[PDB]
Design a protein around this ligand. Structure first.
Ligand SMILES: *[C@@H]1O[C@H](CO)[C@@H](O)[C@H](O)[C@H]1NC(C)=O
Lengths: 396, 99
């Protein structure tokens, strides 16, 4: 059961007469679905991603400044000028400088001065944005039958099934092996706000940073840096990384305002990360809405022999899961497929079985089946698996 | 670590005392059992307040008591005052607890 691997979980319960359950599935959540006379199911939103989402605006984090050129004129001669002022990839400022005799100039007054600095971006100091397309984004929903098999989070359940929901994907049927069929219809517009969302990406090779951040579209367009679109040759607003020092005769002081990477990372502290599996850009938060069809699921092995009540041992003793459920695993020593004789008793009242199983009709197979999950009332209880027993105290 | 929590429960018929239930003076009861299967197994130990068979009242001081291919028969436990029955599967012994 995948939803034991997570400390966020939900439990959904249908009666014997149920069909088409409606869910919100969230990234890093998981839902266990239960219905009377049906096998229970773990259903989760595995991922939301796109292959190669469209590059939007690039920003420059650190300017590389060069070719500072100055021209200046005496107070009568009007504007000083440079061809730079008209070239691509330059920053310029025009100002008034005090002039006089000995400033190698005819008259005491203010002379026009112009300075221009050539201003490319520093190597690998780009913050690129990407935008999702509702016509190419994939939601992934995963399902597993809630069998008596325990498999770790670094391991895969053989009954695990996967459905991709693109916009071109209609109501999809997954054959849960011997457990029948489940059907899913997840509406890709009944999910994340893809217009409001940018995947912000820096250097992918940065060993001590996130691969990307999930950032708001308006905030990204409000980043106060030089910027350009994909394939554009030169930075808009290159001024934002250059300061000019107050004019001195025939000088105005070009200052590179330094690397703004740490300014960005402070404004990205605690912000949701996004993973980048090569070409796949993954959200790590967000959700989808689905209808799940239970109406073609089957109970496995309801016609199997009850197991020999003597032949059980624990593999894993009754344990609190943190979800108010108790989990355990048993071995069985007959060479058989059989129904596990599981029950639990409120201590001192042996007649009323109080085991609400989460694994319905628990069964041991020729390989697999020993794991059981159940819910119990507060106070002292005894769990039984035939002749095995374990006194269990239930909190709250 | 708890030893042998994955061992078979012992055959409830195959017990005898080596040493009958005895007051230790520490409010605990002590005893030792033999077991006649050729096995390592978990001892099926419990105790009952006399006339109320449903509630097991054995607070063991030896947790998960186990018989091994050599060793393991000794059990220590604590019990409520008055009449009790100690069981080790099909072995039993009526025990009266002081105070
Ligand atoms: C999962 O991790 C455990 C502990 O390291 C290891 O024994 C087991 O083989 C791993 N399973 C897989 C399929 O990687």
């Amino acid at each position: 059961s995948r939803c034991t691997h997570l400390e966020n979980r939900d439990f959904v319960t249908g009666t014997q007469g149920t069909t088409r359950v409606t869910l919100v599935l969230e990234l890093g959540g998981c839902v266990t679905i239960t219905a009377e006379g049906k096998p229970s199911m773990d259903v989760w939103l595995d991922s939301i991603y796109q292959e190669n989402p469209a590059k939007t605006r690039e920003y420059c984090l650190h300017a590389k400044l060069s070719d500072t050129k100055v021209a200046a004129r005496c107070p009568t001669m009007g504007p000083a000028t440079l061809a730079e002022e008209h070239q691509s990839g330059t920053v310029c400022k025009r100002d008034q400088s005090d002039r006089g005799w000995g400033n190698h100039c005819g008259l005491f007054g203010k002379g026009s001065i112009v300075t221009c600095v050539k201003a490319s971006c520093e190597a690998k100091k780009k913050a690129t944005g990407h935008v999702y397309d509702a016509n190419k984004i994939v939601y992934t929903v995963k399902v597993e039958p809630h069998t008596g098999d325990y498999v770790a989070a670094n391991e895969t359940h053989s009954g695990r099934k996967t459905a991709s929901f693109t916009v071109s994907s209609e109501k999809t049927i997954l054959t849960m092996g011997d457990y029948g069929d489940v059907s899913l219809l997840c509406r890709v517009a009944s999910g994340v706000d893809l217009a409001q969302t940018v995947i912000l990406e820096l250097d992918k090779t940065s060993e001590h940073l996130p691969t990307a951040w999930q950032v708001h579209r308006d905030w990204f367009n409000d980043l106060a840096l030089p910027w350009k679109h994909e394939g554009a040759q030169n930075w808009n607003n290159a001024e934002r990384l250059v300061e000019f020092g107050a004019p001195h005769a025939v000088k105005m002081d070009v200052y590179n305002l330094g690397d703004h990477t740490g300014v960005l990372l402070k404004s990205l502290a605690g912000v949701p990360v996004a993973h980048i599996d090569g070409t796949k850009y993954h959200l790590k938060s967000g959700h989808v809405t689905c209808e799940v069809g239970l109406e073609k699921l089957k109970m496995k092995g309801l016609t199997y022999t009850m197991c020999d009540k003597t032949k059980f041992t624990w593999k894993r003793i009754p344990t609190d899961s943190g979800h108010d459920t108790v989990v355990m695993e048993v071995a069985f020593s007959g060479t058989k497929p059989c129904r596990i004789p599981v029950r639990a008793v409120a201590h001192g009242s042996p007649d009323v079985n109080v085991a609400m199983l989460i694994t319905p009709n628990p069964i041991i197979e020729n390989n697999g089946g020993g794991f059981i999950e159940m819910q119990l009332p507060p106070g002292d209880n005894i769990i039984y698996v035939g002749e095995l027993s374990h006194q269990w105290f239930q909190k709250g």
